[PDB]
Amino acid sequence: TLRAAVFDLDGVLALPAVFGVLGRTEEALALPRGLLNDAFQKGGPEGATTRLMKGEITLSQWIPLMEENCRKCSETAKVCLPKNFSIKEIFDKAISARKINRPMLQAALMLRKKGFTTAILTNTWLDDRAERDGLAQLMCELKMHFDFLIESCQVGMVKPEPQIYKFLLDTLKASPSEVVFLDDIGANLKPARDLGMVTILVQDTDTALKELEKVTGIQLLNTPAPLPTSCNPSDMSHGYVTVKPRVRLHFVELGSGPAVCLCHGFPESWYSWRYQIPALAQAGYRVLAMDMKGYGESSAPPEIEEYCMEVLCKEMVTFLDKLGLSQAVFIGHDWGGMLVWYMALFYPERVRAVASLNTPFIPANPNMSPLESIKANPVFDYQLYFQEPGVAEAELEQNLSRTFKSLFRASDESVLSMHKVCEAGGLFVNSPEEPSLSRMVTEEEIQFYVQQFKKSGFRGPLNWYRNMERNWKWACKSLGRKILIPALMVTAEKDFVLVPQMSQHMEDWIPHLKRGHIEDCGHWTQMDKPTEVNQILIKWLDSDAR
Protein backbone atom coordinates (compact mmCIF):
# COMPACT_ATOMS: atom_id res chain seq x y z
CA THR A 1 0.00 0.00 0.00
CA LEU A 2 2.80 2.53 0.86
CA ARG A 3 4.14 3.84 -2.49
CA ALA A 4 5.81 7.12 -1.52
CA ALA A 5 8.20 8.59 1.02
CA VAL A 6 8.56 12.28 1.80
CA PHE A 7 11.41 13.81 3.71
CA ASP A 8 11.97 17.20 5.29
CA LEU A 9 15.41 18.86 4.81
CA ASP A 10 16.33 20.61 8.03
CA GLY A 11 16.73 17.97 10.82
CA VAL A 12 15.81 15.02 8.60
CA LEU A 13 17.97 14.88 5.43
CA ALA A 14 20.44 17.45 6.80
CA LEU A 15 22.02 17.93 10.26
CA PRO A 16 22.33 19.82 12.55
CA ALA A 17 19.03 21.74 11.97
CA VAL A 18 19.08 25.61 12.21
CA PHE A 19 16.26 25.90 14.82
CA GLY A 20 18.89 24.19 17.00
CA VAL A 21 21.32 27.00 16.27
CA LEU A 22 18.86 29.44 17.74
CA GLY A 23 18.81 27.23 20.94
CA ARG A 24 22.59 26.76 20.91
CA THR A 25 23.19 30.47 20.35
CA GLU A 26 20.87 31.49 23.25
CA GLU A 27 22.93 29.14 25.47
CA ALA A 28 26.40 30.12 24.11
CA LEU A 29 25.51 33.73 24.76
CA ALA A 30 23.51 33.26 27.93
CA LEU A 31 20.32 34.87 26.49
CA PRO A 32 16.83 34.05 27.90
CA ARG A 33 15.90 30.56 26.79
CA GLY A 34 13.58 30.73 23.74
CA LEU A 35 14.21 34.45 23.00
CA LEU A 36 15.69 33.80 19.55
CA ASN A 37 13.07 31.26 18.68
CA ASP A 38 10.39 33.88 19.73
CA ALA A 39 11.97 36.52 17.49
CA PHE A 40 12.10 33.88 14.66
CA GLN A 41 8.35 33.06 14.88
CA LYS A 42 7.32 36.58 15.77
CA GLY A 43 3.97 37.37 14.21
CA GLY A 44 3.04 33.79 13.22
CA PRO A 45 1.34 33.54 9.81
CA GLU A 46 1.86 37.30 9.18
CA GLY A 47 5.47 37.60 10.45
CA ALA A 48 8.77 38.22 8.72
CA THR A 49 9.68 34.49 8.74
CA THR A 50 6.51 33.30 6.99
CA ARG A 51 6.95 35.96 4.33
CA LEU A 52 10.51 34.63 3.94
CA MET A 53 9.41 30.93 3.68
CA LYS A 54 6.65 31.86 1.18
CA GLY A 55 9.11 33.59 -1.26
CA GLU A 56 7.75 37.09 -0.69
CA ILE A 57 11.10 38.46 0.43
CA THR A 58 14.71 37.16 0.18
CA LEU A 59 17.01 35.97 2.95
CA SER A 60 18.94 39.25 2.86
CA GLN A 61 15.81 41.38 3.15
CA TRP A 62 14.73 39.19 6.11
CA ILE A 63 17.90 39.55 8.17
CA PRO A 64 17.18 43.06 9.49
CA LEU A 65 13.52 42.11 10.19
CA MET A 66 14.77 39.25 12.46
CA GLU A 67 17.18 41.82 13.93
CA GLU A 68 14.32 44.09 14.92
CA ASN A 69 12.30 41.11 16.23
CA CYS A 70 15.29 40.20 18.47
CA ARG A 71 15.51 43.83 19.80
CA LYS A 72 11.73 43.90 20.54
CA CYS A 73 11.91 40.48 22.35
CA SER A 74 14.95 41.50 24.42
CA GLU A 75 13.21 44.81 25.37
CA THR A 76 10.09 43.02 26.65
CA ALA A 77 12.28 40.32 28.38
CA LYS A 78 14.24 43.31 29.88
CA VAL A 79 17.68 41.96 28.83
CA CYS A 80 20.45 43.31 26.59
CA LEU A 81 21.58 41.73 23.35
CA PRO A 82 25.42 41.18 23.38
CA LYS A 83 27.69 43.81 21.73
CA ASN A 84 28.48 42.44 18.24
CA PHE A 85 25.22 40.41 18.14
CA SER A 86 24.72 39.43 14.55
CA ILE A 87 21.92 37.49 12.80
CA LYS A 88 23.83 37.33 9.59
CA GLU A 89 26.73 35.84 11.46
CA ILE A 90 24.59 33.34 13.45
CA PHE A 91 22.87 32.07 10.22
CA ASP A 92 25.96 32.12 7.98
CA LYS A 93 27.59 29.65 10.41
CA ALA A 94 24.42 27.57 10.94
CA ILE A 95 23.78 27.15 7.21
CA SER A 96 27.46 26.08 6.60
CA ALA A 97 27.38 23.78 9.66
CA ARG A 98 24.55 21.71 8.26
CA LYS A 99 25.57 18.53 6.27
CA ILE A 100 23.72 15.68 4.62
CA ASN A 101 22.56 13.10 7.21
CA ARG A 102 23.99 10.15 5.26
CA PRO A 103 21.93 7.38 6.92
CA MET A 104 18.67 9.14 5.99
CA LEU A 105 19.76 9.78 2.37
CA GLN A 106 20.82 6.13 2.24
CA ALA A 107 17.33 5.02 3.45
CA ALA A 108 15.63 7.30 0.87
CA LEU A 109 17.91 5.88 -1.90
CA MET A 110 16.98 2.33 -0.81
CA LEU A 111 13.23 3.05 -0.79
CA ARG A 112 13.56 4.58 -4.27
CA LYS A 113 15.49 1.56 -5.51
CA LYS A 114 12.67 -0.75 -4.38
CA GLY A 115 10.16 1.45 -6.19
CA PHE A 116 9.04 4.30 -3.89
CA THR A 117 8.37 7.68 -5.30
CA THR A 118 10.51 9.97 -3.16
CA ALA A 119 10.18 13.67 -2.41
CA ILE A 120 11.81 16.39 -0.29
CA LEU A 121 9.29 18.85 1.09
CA THR A 122 10.85 21.83 2.80
CA ASN A 123 10.22 25.20 4.39
CA THR A 124 13.05 27.16 2.80
CA TRP A 125 14.11 30.59 1.53
CA LEU A 126 15.44 32.48 -1.44
CA ASP A 127 19.03 32.73 -0.46
CA ASP A 128 20.86 35.88 -1.72
CA ARG A 129 23.72 36.02 0.83
CA ALA A 130 27.33 36.36 -0.38
CA GLU A 131 27.75 32.77 0.88
CA ARG A 132 24.71 31.25 -0.88
CA ASP A 133 26.78 28.86 -3.02
CA GLY A 134 27.10 26.62 0.10
CA LEU A 135 23.45 25.93 0.27
CA ALA A 136 23.16 25.68 -3.55
CA GLN A 137 25.77 22.91 -3.42
CA LEU A 138 23.90 20.96 -0.65
CA MET A 139 20.60 21.15 -2.51
CA CYS A 140 22.23 19.89 -5.68
CA GLU A 141 23.88 17.01 -3.94
CA LEU A 142 20.56 16.05 -2.29
CA LYS A 143 17.96 16.76 -4.93
CA MET A 144 19.41 14.39 -7.60
CA HIS A 145 18.40 11.36 -5.53
CA PHE A 146 14.72 12.27 -5.38
CA ASP A 147 11.62 12.32 -7.72
CA PHE A 148 10.60 15.77 -6.48
CA LEU A 149 11.80 18.63 -4.40
CA ILE A 150 9.02 20.94 -3.25
CA GLU A 151 10.23 24.26 -1.73
CA SER A 152 8.01 26.48 0.27
CA CYS A 153 9.52 29.62 -1.26
CA GLN A 154 8.98 28.38 -4.87
CA VAL A 155 5.32 27.40 -4.30
CA GLY A 156 4.15 30.29 -2.04
CA MET A 157 2.85 27.93 0.70
CA VAL A 158 4.49 26.59 3.90
CA LYS A 159 4.21 23.67 6.32
CA PRO A 160 1.80 23.44 8.34
CA GLU A 161 -0.80 25.14 6.02
CA PRO A 162 -2.94 22.34 4.66
CA GLN A 163 -2.75 23.50 1.00
CA ILE A 164 0.90 22.45 0.78
CA TYR A 165 -0.03 18.80 1.65
CA LYS A 166 -2.70 18.88 -1.01
CA PHE A 167 -0.04 20.26 -3.39
CA LEU A 168 2.32 17.47 -2.24
CA LEU A 169 -0.36 14.71 -2.92
CA ASP A 170 -1.01 16.07 -6.37
CA THR A 171 2.71 16.13 -7.14
CA LEU A 172 3.08 12.53 -5.92
CA LYS A 173 -0.13 11.42 -7.78
CA ALA A 174 -0.75 9.26 -4.72
CA SER A 175 -3.45 9.15 -2.04
CA PRO A 176 -2.70 10.04 1.57
CA SER A 177 -2.65 6.41 2.83
CA GLU A 178 0.08 5.56 0.33
CA VAL A 179 2.46 8.12 1.82
CA VAL A 180 4.90 8.01 4.71
CA PHE A 181 6.03 11.48 5.65
CA LEU A 182 8.97 12.24 8.04
CA ASP A 183 9.53 15.57 9.87
CA ASP A 184 11.36 16.72 12.99
CA ILE A 185 8.55 19.20 13.92
CA GLY A 186 5.35 17.62 15.26
CA ALA A 187 3.06 20.50 14.24
CA ASN A 188 4.19 19.83 10.64
CA LEU A 189 3.11 16.19 10.88
CA LYS A 190 -0.38 16.98 12.15
CA PRO A 191 -1.90 17.87 8.77
CA ALA A 192 -0.28 14.85 7.13
CA ARG A 193 -1.82 12.70 9.85
CA ASP A 194 -5.35 14.38 9.38
CA LEU A 195 -5.28 13.15 5.76
CA GLY A 196 -4.25 9.59 6.86
CA MET A 197 -0.54 9.69 5.87
CA VAL A 198 1.88 7.53 7.92
CA THR A 199 3.97 10.19 9.63
CA ILE A 200 7.28 9.73 11.51
CA LEU A 201 8.43 12.20 14.13
CA VAL A 202 12.27 12.31 13.59
CA GLN A 203 14.39 12.81 16.70
CA ASP A 204 17.52 10.64 16.44
CA THR A 205 17.85 9.21 12.98
CA ASP A 206 18.13 5.48 13.88
CA THR A 207 14.80 5.39 15.74
CA ALA A 208 12.97 7.10 12.80
CA LEU A 209 14.62 4.58 10.41
CA LYS A 210 13.41 1.81 12.71
CA GLU A 211 9.87 3.11 12.49
CA LEU A 212 10.33 3.66 8.70
CA GLU A 213 11.66 0.16 8.26
CA LYS A 214 8.79 -1.41 10.20
CA VAL A 215 6.17 0.61 8.37
CA THR A 216 7.50 -0.02 4.83
CA GLY A 217 8.73 -3.65 5.57
CA ILE A 218 12.02 -2.96 3.74
CA GLN A 219 15.44 -3.11 5.38
CA LEU A 220 16.91 0.38 5.85
CA LEU A 221 19.10 0.01 8.88
CA ASN A 222 22.30 -2.13 9.12
CA THR A 223 21.94 -2.72 5.40
CA PRO A 224 25.15 -3.43 3.48
CA ALA A 225 27.35 -0.49 2.34
CA PRO A 226 25.77 0.77 -0.91
CA LEU A 227 27.57 1.45 -4.21
CA PRO A 228 28.52 4.99 -5.20
CA THR A 229 26.04 6.96 -7.38
CA SER A 230 26.00 5.80 -11.03
CA CYS A 231 25.17 7.78 -14.19
CA ASN A 232 22.06 7.64 -16.22
CA PRO A 233 23.34 8.20 -19.83
CA SER A 234 20.35 10.40 -20.77
CA ASP A 235 20.75 12.71 -17.79
CA MET A 236 24.32 13.64 -18.69
CA SER A 237 25.61 16.62 -20.63
CA HIS A 238 27.09 15.19 -23.82
CA GLY A 239 29.94 17.07 -25.51
CA TYR A 240 31.38 16.88 -28.99
CA VAL A 241 34.58 18.28 -30.35
CA THR A 242 35.98 17.94 -33.92
CA VAL A 243 39.82 17.60 -33.58
CA LYS A 244 40.34 17.32 -37.37
CA PRO A 245 38.12 16.90 -40.50
CA ARG A 246 37.22 13.19 -40.18
CA VAL A 247 37.38 12.88 -36.31
CA ARG A 248 35.06 14.06 -33.55
CA LEU A 249 35.45 13.08 -29.90
CA HIS A 250 32.48 12.58 -27.60
CA PHE A 251 32.58 13.07 -23.88
CA VAL A 252 30.25 13.27 -20.90
CA GLU A 253 30.86 16.25 -18.62
CA LEU A 254 29.92 16.89 -14.97
CA GLY A 255 30.93 19.33 -12.17
CA SER A 256 33.14 22.43 -11.91
CA GLY A 257 36.71 22.99 -10.67
CA PRO A 258 40.03 21.66 -12.05
CA ALA A 259 39.47 19.66 -15.32
CA VAL A 260 39.93 15.87 -14.92
CA CYS A 261 39.89 13.88 -18.13
CA LEU A 262 38.96 10.17 -17.86
CA CYS A 263 40.36 7.75 -20.43
CA HIS A 264 38.86 4.17 -20.57
CA GLY A 265 40.51 0.90 -21.69
CA PHE A 266 39.75 -1.82 -24.28
CA PRO A 267 36.91 -2.55 -25.16
CA GLU A 268 35.13 -0.01 -23.01
CA SER A 269 33.23 3.35 -22.96
CA TRP A 270 32.91 6.63 -21.02
CA TYR A 271 30.32 4.59 -19.15
CA SER A 272 33.09 2.51 -17.62
CA TRP A 273 33.62 5.53 -15.32
CA ARG A 274 29.94 5.70 -14.26
CA TYR A 275 30.81 5.08 -10.59
CA GLN A 276 33.58 7.77 -10.54
CA ILE A 277 31.85 10.50 -12.52
CA PRO A 278 29.36 11.74 -9.79
CA ALA A 279 31.91 11.22 -6.91
CA LEU A 280 34.75 13.31 -8.57
CA ALA A 281 32.28 16.12 -9.52
CA GLN A 282 30.94 16.04 -5.97
CA ALA A 283 34.62 16.27 -4.79
CA GLY A 284 35.12 19.60 -6.51
CA TYR A 285 36.32 18.59 -10.04
CA ARG A 286 35.22 19.11 -13.65
CA VAL A 287 34.99 15.60 -15.01
CA LEU A 288 35.34 14.95 -18.75
CA ALA A 289 34.68 11.15 -19.36
CA MET A 290 35.73 10.35 -22.92
CA ASP A 291 34.69 7.92 -25.55
CA MET A 292 38.21 7.37 -26.83
CA LYS A 293 38.76 7.30 -30.59
CA GLY A 294 37.22 4.18 -32.06
CA TYR A 295 34.47 4.01 -29.42
CA GLY A 296 30.84 4.87 -28.79
CA GLU A 297 29.89 8.22 -30.21
CA SER A 298 33.55 9.26 -31.02
CA SER A 299 34.70 8.75 -34.65
CA ALA A 300 36.12 5.48 -35.72
CA PRO A 301 38.19 5.76 -38.98
CA PRO A 302 39.19 2.32 -40.43
CA GLU A 303 42.92 2.93 -40.91
CA ILE A 304 45.41 1.37 -38.49
CA GLU A 305 47.71 4.44 -38.17
CA GLU A 306 44.86 6.62 -36.97
CA TYR A 307 45.25 4.70 -33.69
CA CYS A 308 49.05 4.90 -33.05
CA MET A 309 49.89 6.70 -29.75
CA GLU A 310 51.45 9.73 -31.40
CA VAL A 311 48.24 10.55 -33.24
CA LEU A 312 45.99 9.63 -30.30
CA CYS A 313 47.98 11.97 -27.96
CA LYS A 314 48.10 14.87 -30.50
CA GLU A 315 44.35 14.52 -30.90
CA MET A 316 43.90 14.65 -27.06
CA VAL A 317 45.98 17.89 -27.10
CA THR A 318 43.78 19.32 -29.86
CA PHE A 319 40.83 18.38 -27.60
CA LEU A 320 42.10 20.59 -24.79
CA ASP A 321 42.86 23.35 -27.33
CA LYS A 322 39.31 23.46 -28.74
CA LEU A 323 37.80 23.28 -25.29
CA GLY A 324 40.04 26.22 -24.25
CA LEU A 325 41.77 24.11 -21.53
CA SER A 326 45.44 24.83 -20.83
CA GLN A 327 45.61 21.65 -18.68
CA ALA A 328 43.68 18.67 -17.48
CA VAL A 329 44.45 15.98 -14.94
CA PHE A 330 44.63 12.71 -17.00
CA ILE A 331 43.46 9.54 -15.41
CA GLY A 332 43.48 6.36 -17.50
CA HIS A 333 42.76 2.62 -17.21
CA ASP A 334 44.20 -0.26 -19.42
CA TRP A 335 44.83 1.28 -22.92
CA GLY A 336 43.66 4.72 -21.55
CA GLY A 337 46.44 4.18 -18.96
CA MET A 338 49.17 3.69 -21.49
CA LEU A 339 47.96 6.81 -23.28
CA VAL A 340 48.10 9.12 -20.20
CA TRP A 341 51.60 8.05 -19.41
CA TYR A 342 52.43 9.14 -22.96
CA MET A 343 50.65 12.49 -22.40
CA ALA A 344 52.81 12.94 -19.30
CA LEU A 345 55.99 12.15 -21.34
CA PHE A 346 55.25 14.20 -24.49
CA TYR A 347 53.01 17.07 -23.25
CA PRO A 348 53.77 17.62 -19.51
CA GLU A 349 52.80 21.37 -19.93
CA ARG A 350 49.28 20.14 -20.73
CA VAL A 351 48.98 17.53 -17.88
CA ARG A 352 48.18 18.95 -14.41
CA ALA A 353 48.67 15.42 -12.92
CA VAL A 354 48.63 11.89 -14.25
CA ALA A 355 47.17 8.67 -12.86
CA SER A 356 46.84 5.14 -14.18
CA LEU A 357 44.77 2.14 -13.01
CA ASN A 358 46.35 -1.26 -13.70
CA THR A 359 48.62 -0.06 -16.58
CA PRO A 360 52.24 0.30 -15.50
CA PHE A 361 54.71 2.56 -17.23
CA ILE A 362 57.44 0.46 -18.81
CA PRO A 363 59.92 2.33 -21.01
CA ALA A 364 60.29 0.89 -24.54
CA ASN A 365 63.31 -1.41 -24.85
CA PRO A 366 65.48 0.09 -27.60
CA ASN A 367 67.11 -3.31 -28.34
CA MET A 368 64.13 -5.63 -28.49
CA SER A 369 61.35 -5.30 -31.07
CA PRO A 370 57.99 -4.97 -29.36
CA LEU A 371 56.63 -8.09 -31.14
CA GLU A 372 59.48 -10.09 -29.62
CA SER A 373 58.90 -8.33 -26.28
CA ILE A 374 55.26 -9.41 -26.42
CA LYS A 375 56.05 -13.11 -27.10
CA ALA A 376 58.10 -12.95 -23.82
CA ASN A 377 54.92 -13.05 -21.66
CA PRO A 378 52.47 -15.96 -22.11
CA VAL A 379 49.65 -13.75 -20.73
CA PHE A 380 50.09 -11.18 -23.56
CA ASP A 381 49.30 -13.84 -26.22
CA TYR A 382 45.85 -12.28 -26.75
CA GLN A 383 47.80 -9.30 -28.23
CA LEU A 384 49.07 -11.42 -31.12
CA TYR A 385 45.66 -12.85 -31.66
CA PHE A 386 44.56 -9.16 -32.12
CA GLN A 387 47.03 -8.34 -34.96
CA GLU A 388 45.49 -9.84 -38.12
CA PRO A 389 42.87 -7.47 -39.31
CA GLY A 390 39.44 -9.11 -39.27
CA VAL A 391 40.10 -12.14 -37.14
CA ALA A 392 39.32 -10.75 -33.64
CA GLU A 393 36.65 -8.49 -35.14
CA ALA A 394 34.60 -11.48 -36.32
CA GLU A 395 34.78 -13.25 -32.91
CA LEU A 396 34.14 -10.10 -30.87
CA GLU A 397 31.30 -8.83 -33.14
CA GLN A 398 29.53 -12.10 -33.57
CA ASN A 399 27.51 -11.88 -30.34
CA LEU A 400 27.95 -8.57 -28.46
CA SER A 401 26.06 -9.66 -25.37
CA ARG A 402 28.24 -12.71 -24.95
CA THR A 403 31.37 -10.60 -25.60
CA PHE A 404 30.68 -8.14 -22.76
CA LYS A 405 29.14 -10.75 -20.48
CA SER A 406 32.35 -12.90 -20.96
CA LEU A 407 34.91 -10.03 -20.50
CA PHE A 408 33.26 -8.03 -17.73
CA ARG A 409 33.62 -10.47 -14.81
CA ALA A 410 35.11 -10.15 -11.26
CA SER A 411 38.30 -12.07 -10.52
CA ASP A 412 36.55 -15.15 -8.93
CA GLU A 413 34.12 -15.46 -11.90
CA SER A 414 36.55 -15.60 -14.82
CA VAL A 415 35.48 -17.68 -17.85
CA LEU A 416 38.39 -16.92 -20.19
CA SER A 417 41.89 -18.05 -19.54
CA MET A 418 44.23 -15.66 -21.28
CA HIS A 419 46.35 -18.77 -22.04
CA LYS A 420 47.28 -19.79 -25.61
CA VAL A 421 44.58 -17.71 -27.30
CA CYS A 422 46.22 -18.06 -30.74
CA GLU A 423 46.52 -21.87 -30.47
CA ALA A 424 42.88 -22.17 -29.23
CA GLY A 425 41.69 -20.07 -32.18
CA GLY A 426 39.94 -17.41 -30.08
CA LEU A 427 39.30 -15.55 -26.87
CA PHE A 428 35.96 -17.37 -26.28
CA VAL A 429 36.53 -20.75 -27.99
CA ASN A 430 36.19 -22.34 -24.56
CA SER A 431 33.56 -20.20 -22.77
CA PRO A 432 29.65 -20.40 -22.72
CA GLU A 433 27.18 -19.31 -25.41
CA GLU A 434 25.06 -17.63 -22.83
CA PRO A 435 27.35 -16.55 -19.94
CA SER A 436 25.79 -15.77 -16.54
CA LEU A 437 25.65 -12.17 -15.42
CA SER A 438 28.62 -10.98 -13.36
CA ARG A 439 27.90 -9.57 -9.84
CA MET A 440 29.56 -6.45 -11.20
CA VAL A 441 26.95 -5.56 -13.82
CA THR A 442 23.21 -5.48 -14.32
CA GLU A 443 21.61 -6.72 -17.60
CA GLU A 444 20.80 -3.11 -18.58
CA GLU A 445 24.41 -2.10 -18.20
CA ILE A 446 25.65 -4.98 -20.47
CA GLN A 447 23.06 -3.71 -23.06
CA PHE A 448 24.36 -0.09 -23.07
CA TYR A 449 27.77 -1.38 -24.05
CA VAL A 450 26.09 -3.68 -26.65
CA GLN A 451 24.27 -0.66 -28.14
CA GLN A 452 27.48 1.40 -28.14
CA PHE A 453 29.39 -1.28 -30.04
CA LYS A 454 26.69 -1.51 -32.68
CA LYS A 455 27.81 1.89 -34.02
CA SER A 456 31.36 0.92 -35.05
CA GLY A 457 32.26 -2.54 -33.75
CA PHE A 458 35.75 -3.66 -32.96
CA ARG A 459 37.96 -2.48 -35.83
CA GLY A 460 38.86 0.92 -34.32
CA PRO A 461 39.31 -0.47 -30.78
CA LEU A 462 41.42 -3.41 -32.06
CA ASN A 463 43.50 -0.97 -34.07
CA TRP A 464 44.90 0.38 -30.78
CA TYR A 465 46.94 -2.92 -30.62
CA ARG A 466 48.05 -2.78 -34.22
CA ASN A 467 50.82 -0.13 -33.98
CA MET A 468 53.34 -1.94 -31.78
CA GLU A 469 56.31 -0.93 -34.03
CA ARG A 470 55.21 2.69 -34.63
CA ASN A 471 54.56 3.31 -30.88
CA TRP A 472 57.93 1.65 -30.05
CA LYS A 473 59.92 3.98 -32.32
CA TRP A 474 58.02 6.99 -30.98
CA ALA A 475 58.43 5.86 -27.37
CA CYS A 476 62.27 5.48 -27.92
CA LYS A 477 62.48 9.28 -28.38
CA SER A 478 61.49 9.64 -24.73
CA LEU A 479 64.01 7.34 -23.10
CA GLY A 480 66.15 10.18 -21.80
CA ARG A 481 63.24 11.76 -19.93
CA LYS A 482 61.70 11.25 -16.52
CA ILE A 483 58.11 12.01 -15.41
CA LEU A 484 58.39 14.64 -12.79
CA ILE A 485 54.82 15.96 -12.72
CA PRO A 486 52.45 14.51 -10.07
CA ALA A 487 51.69 10.83 -10.76
CA LEU A 488 49.71 8.03 -9.21
CA MET A 489 49.87 4.39 -10.08
CA VAL A 490 47.00 2.10 -8.86
CA THR A 491 47.58 -1.63 -8.88
CA ALA A 492 44.78 -4.21 -8.71
CA GLU A 493 45.70 -7.46 -6.86
CA LYS A 494 43.92 -9.88 -9.14
CA ASP A 495 44.41 -8.45 -12.56
CA PHE A 496 46.01 -11.46 -14.17
CA VAL A 497 47.38 -9.60 -17.15
CA LEU A 498 48.45 -6.20 -15.85
CA VAL A 499 49.79 -7.83 -12.66
CA PRO A 500 50.97 -5.48 -9.80
CA GLN A 501 54.61 -6.82 -10.05
CA MET A 502 54.77 -5.37 -13.62
CA SER A 503 54.77 -1.91 -12.05
CA GLN A 504 57.70 -2.56 -9.67
CA HIS A 505 60.47 -0.55 -11.38
CA MET A 506 58.33 2.48 -12.06
CA GLU A 507 60.13 4.70 -9.50
CA ASP A 508 63.28 4.55 -11.73
CA TRP A 509 61.41 6.66 -14.34
CA ILE A 510 58.94 8.42 -12.00
CA PRO A 511 60.84 9.07 -8.77
CA HIS A 512 58.05 10.91 -6.85
CA LEU A 513 55.40 8.41 -7.95
CA LYS A 514 52.51 7.86 -5.54
CA ARG A 515 50.67 4.51 -5.30
CA GLY A 516 47.42 2.88 -4.18
CA HIS A 517 46.72 -0.80 -4.32
CA ILE A 518 43.37 -2.51 -4.37
CA GLU A 519 42.91 -5.99 -3.02
CA ASP A 520 40.54 -8.51 -4.39
CA CYS A 521 40.17 -6.40 -7.45
CA GLY A 522 40.27 -7.82 -10.97
CA HIS A 523 40.94 -6.10 -14.29
CA TRP A 524 37.70 -4.00 -14.50
CA THR A 525 38.86 -1.86 -11.73
CA GLN A 526 36.35 0.98 -11.85
CA MET A 527 33.32 -1.32 -11.51
CA ASP A 528 34.89 -4.13 -9.50
CA LYS A 529 35.90 -1.77 -6.62
CA PRO A 530 34.25 1.61 -7.30
CA THR A 531 34.21 2.71 -3.62
CA GLU A 532 37.98 2.20 -3.10
CA VAL A 533 38.88 3.65 -6.54
CA ASN A 534 36.93 6.81 -5.67
CA GLN A 535 38.63 7.18 -2.27
CA ILE A 536 42.15 6.69 -3.70
CA LEU A 537 41.48 9.16 -6.59
CA ILE A 538 39.80 11.90 -4.57
CA LYS A 539 42.47 11.68 -1.86
CA TRP A 540 45.24 11.98 -4.57
CA LEU A 541 43.51 14.81 -6.53
CA ASP A 542 42.95 16.82 -3.34
CA SER A 543 46.57 16.49 -2.26
CA ASP A 544 48.40 16.54 -5.66
CA ALA A 545 46.23 18.24 -8.29
CA ARG A 546 44.84 21.03 -6.18
Ligand X SMILES: Cn1c(N)c(N2CCCCC2)c(=O)[nH]c1=O
Annotated binding site for phosphate: 122-123
CA distance 147 to 124: 18
Contacts of 212 (CB under 8 A, 6+ apart): 5, 107, 180, 182, 200, 220
Which range touches its own copies (CB under 8 A), out of 168-176, 232-240, 384-392, 429-437?
232-240
Q: Which amino acid is at 462?
A: L
Residues making up the chain, counted from first to last: 546
From residue 153 to residue 182, the character string flagging contacts with its own copies as x (rule: CB under 8 A) and all else as - is -x-x--------------------------
Query: Shortest Cβ distance from residue 9 to Mg ion (Å)?
Result: 7
Closest among 290, 231, 288, 281 to 257, alpha carbons compared: 281
Contact flag: residue 143 with its own copies (CB under 8 A): yes
Nearest by Cα to 107 from 169, 159, 180: 180
DSSP state of 260: E
Give the shortest CB-367-to-Mg ion separation in angstroms.
Answer: 38
Residues numbered 251-290 forming contacts with ligand X, rule: CB under 6 A:
266
Q: Which does 327 bind (CB under 5 to 8 A by kind): its own copies, ligand X, Mg ion, none?
A: its own copies
The yes or no reply on residue 523 touching ligand X (CB under 6 A) is yes
CA torsion, ordered 45, 124, 189, 213, to nearest 10 deg: 180
Among 7, 8, 59, 453, binds Mg ion (CB under 5 A): 8
Buried residues in 486-505 as b, exposed as e (16+ CB within 10 A):
bbbbbbbebbeebbbebbee
Q: Which of 401, 414, 478, 535 binds ligand X (CB under 6 A)?
A: 414
Please, which residue, 286 or 405, has the CB nearer to its own copies? Answer: 286
Residue 114 CB neighbour total at 10 angstroms: 10
**How many residues bind to its own copies according to rule CB under 8 A?**
60
User: Segment contacting ligand X (CB under 6 A): 30-38, 62-70, 180-188, 413-421?
Assistant: 413-421
Catalytic residue among 465, 495, 528, 544: 465
State the Cα–Cα distance between residues 440 and 312, nearest whole angstrom: 30
Binding partner of 369, given ligand X, its own copies, Mg ion, none, CB within 5-8 angstroms per partner class: none
Task: State the Cα–Cα distance between residues 100 and 11, nearest whole angstrom.
Answer: 10
Interface stretch with its own copies, choices 27-35, 66-74, 248-256, 530-538 (CB under 8 A) = 248-256
State the Cα–Cα distance between residues 476 and 309, nearest whole angstrom. 13
Catalytic site includes residue 505: no
Report the site for its own copies in 331-370 (rule: CB under 8 A). 346-350, 352
Interaction residues for Mg ion, span 177-196 (CB under 5 A): 184
Candidates 2, 36, 263, 281; binder of its own copies (CB under 8 A) is: 281
Q: Are 237 and 253 spatial neighbours (Cβ–Cβ below 8 Å)?
A: yes
Residue 107 neighbours by CB under 8 Å, 6+ apart: 209, 212, 213, 220, 221
The answer to the question of residue 128 lying near its own copies (CB under 8 A) is yes
The CB-of-426 to its own copies minimum distance in angstroms stands at 39
CA distance 469 to 464: 12
The footprint of its own copies (CB under 8 A) covers: 51, 55-58, 60-61, 126-128, 132-133, 135-137, 139-140, 143-144, 154, 156, 234-242, 253-256, 259, 278, 281, 286-287, 321-327, 346-350, 352, 477-478, 480-485
**Residues recognised as catalytic:** 334, 465, 523
The footprint of Mg ion (CB under 5 A) covers: 8, 10-11, 184
